[PDB]
Amino acid sequence: MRRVEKVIIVEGRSDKQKVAAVLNEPVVIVCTNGTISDARLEELADELEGYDVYLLADADEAGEKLRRQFRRMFPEAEHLYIDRAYREVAAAPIWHLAQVLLRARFDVRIESLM
Protein backbone atom coordinates (compact mmCIF):
# COMPACT_ATOMS: atom_id res chain seq x y z
CA MET A 1 0.00 0.00 0.00
CA ARG A 2 1.51 3.25 -1.19
CA ARG A 3 1.30 6.43 0.82
CA VAL A 4 -1.85 8.51 0.51
CA GLU A 5 -1.03 11.90 -1.04
CA LYS A 6 -4.32 13.26 -2.33
CA VAL A 7 -6.64 15.42 -0.29
CA ILE A 8 -10.06 16.87 -1.24
CA ILE A 9 -11.53 19.64 0.90
CA VAL A 10 -15.27 20.30 0.84
CA GLU A 11 -17.60 22.52 2.83
CA GLY A 12 -20.43 20.15 3.70
CA ARG A 13 -20.90 16.76 5.33
CA SER A 14 -23.03 15.39 2.50
CA ASP A 15 -20.43 16.63 0.00
CA LYS A 16 -17.83 14.54 1.83
CA GLN A 17 -19.91 11.37 1.83
CA LYS A 18 -20.83 11.85 -1.84
CA VAL A 19 -17.22 12.36 -2.88
CA ALA A 20 -16.07 9.37 -0.83
CA ALA A 21 -18.68 7.18 -2.52
CA VAL A 22 -17.37 7.87 -6.02
CA LEU A 23 -13.69 7.41 -5.27
CA ASN A 24 -11.77 4.23 -6.05
CA GLU A 25 -8.54 5.17 -4.28
CA PRO A 26 -7.88 6.31 -0.69
CA VAL A 27 -8.13 10.09 -0.47
CA VAL A 28 -8.26 12.19 2.65
CA ILE A 29 -11.49 14.17 2.57
CA VAL A 30 -11.59 17.16 4.86
CA CYS A 31 -14.89 18.83 5.60
CA THR A 32 -14.77 22.42 6.85
CA ASN A 33 -18.28 22.05 8.28
CA GLY A 34 -19.23 25.48 6.98
CA THR A 35 -16.83 28.34 7.61
CA ILE A 36 -13.28 27.69 8.81
CA SER A 37 -11.10 30.20 10.62
CA ASP A 38 -7.99 31.56 9.02
CA ALA A 39 -5.94 29.97 11.81
CA ARG A 40 -7.40 26.49 11.25
CA LEU A 41 -6.80 26.89 7.52
CA GLU A 42 -3.19 27.92 8.09
CA GLU A 43 -2.72 24.88 10.33
CA LEU A 44 -4.22 22.66 7.67
CA ALA A 45 -1.96 24.16 4.98
CA ASP A 46 1.03 23.53 7.21
CA GLU A 47 -0.02 19.93 7.86
CA LEU A 48 -0.65 19.33 4.17
CA GLU A 49 2.70 20.56 2.84
CA GLY A 50 3.85 18.04 0.22
CA TYR A 51 0.34 16.69 -0.30
CA ASP A 52 -1.71 17.00 -3.46
CA VAL A 53 -4.62 19.15 -2.31
CA TYR A 54 -7.88 20.12 -4.03
CA LEU A 55 -10.80 22.32 -3.01
CA LEU A 56 -14.28 21.40 -4.32
CA ALA A 57 -16.83 24.07 -3.38
CA ASP A 58 -20.34 24.89 -4.51
CA ALA A 59 -20.77 27.21 -7.47
CA ASP A 60 -22.65 29.70 -5.28
CA GLU A 61 -21.94 32.56 -2.85
CA ALA A 62 -20.88 30.55 0.17
CA GLY A 63 -18.67 28.47 -2.12
CA GLU A 64 -17.06 31.56 -3.61
CA LYS A 65 -16.37 32.93 -0.12
CA LEU A 66 -14.52 29.74 0.76
CA ARG A 67 -12.59 29.87 -2.50
CA ARG A 68 -11.58 33.46 -1.80
CA GLN A 69 -10.34 32.51 1.66
CA PHE A 70 -8.33 29.66 0.17
CA ARG A 71 -6.74 31.86 -2.49
CA ARG A 72 -5.49 34.07 0.36
CA MET A 73 -4.61 31.47 3.04
CA PHE A 74 -3.92 28.23 1.15
CA PRO A 75 -2.83 29.06 -2.41
CA GLU A 76 -1.34 25.55 -2.77
CA ALA A 77 -4.80 24.03 -3.00
CA GLU A 78 -6.03 23.43 -6.54
CA HIS A 79 -9.59 24.50 -7.24
CA LEU A 80 -12.03 21.99 -8.74
CA TYR A 81 -15.34 23.12 -10.15
CA ILE A 82 -18.62 21.50 -10.88
CA ASP A 83 -20.57 22.88 -13.82
CA ARG A 84 -22.09 26.04 -12.39
CA ALA A 85 -25.26 24.81 -14.15
CA TYR A 86 -25.69 22.27 -11.34
CA ARG A 87 -24.79 24.88 -8.69
CA GLU A 88 -24.08 22.67 -5.65
CA VAL A 89 -21.92 19.57 -5.26
CA ALA A 90 -24.94 18.07 -3.48
CA ALA A 91 -27.20 18.68 -6.49
CA ALA A 92 -24.86 17.34 -9.15
CA PRO A 93 -25.45 13.87 -10.53
CA ILE A 94 -23.09 11.21 -9.27
CA TRP A 95 -21.71 10.72 -12.79
CA HIS A 96 -20.90 14.44 -13.10
CA LEU A 97 -18.99 14.53 -9.80
CA ALA A 98 -17.19 11.38 -10.90
CA GLN A 99 -16.22 13.04 -14.20
CA VAL A 100 -14.98 16.20 -12.45
CA LEU A 101 -12.75 14.04 -10.28
CA LEU A 102 -11.66 11.84 -13.17
CA ARG A 103 -10.67 14.95 -15.13
CA ALA A 104 -8.45 15.83 -12.16
CA ARG A 105 -6.85 12.35 -12.27
CA PHE A 106 -8.64 10.66 -9.40
CA ASP A 107 -9.53 6.97 -9.61
CA VAL A 108 -13.32 6.75 -9.56
CA ARG A 109 -15.64 3.73 -9.39
CA ILE A 110 -17.03 2.66 -12.79
CA GLU A 111 -20.39 2.25 -11.08
CA SER A 112 -20.29 5.98 -10.32
CA LEU A 113 -20.61 6.46 -14.09
CA MET A 114 -23.59 4.14 -14.13
8 A C-beta contact, residue 27 and residue 9: no
Cα separation values, 67 from 2, 4, 61, Å = 30, 24, 10
Give the method of determination.
Answer: X-ray
Domains of the chain and CATH, by start: 1-114 (3.40.1360.10)
Closest CA to 113 of 39, 23, 26: 23
Distance CA 76, CA 110 (A): 30
Distance CA 81, CA 55 (A): 8
Strands 78-80 and 6-10 turn out to be: unpaired
Resolution (A): 1.3
DSSP 69-82: HHHHH-TTSEEE--
8 A C-beta contact, residue 102 and residue 108: yes
8 A C-beta contact, residue 52 and residue 76: no
Distance CA 70, CA 80 (A): 12
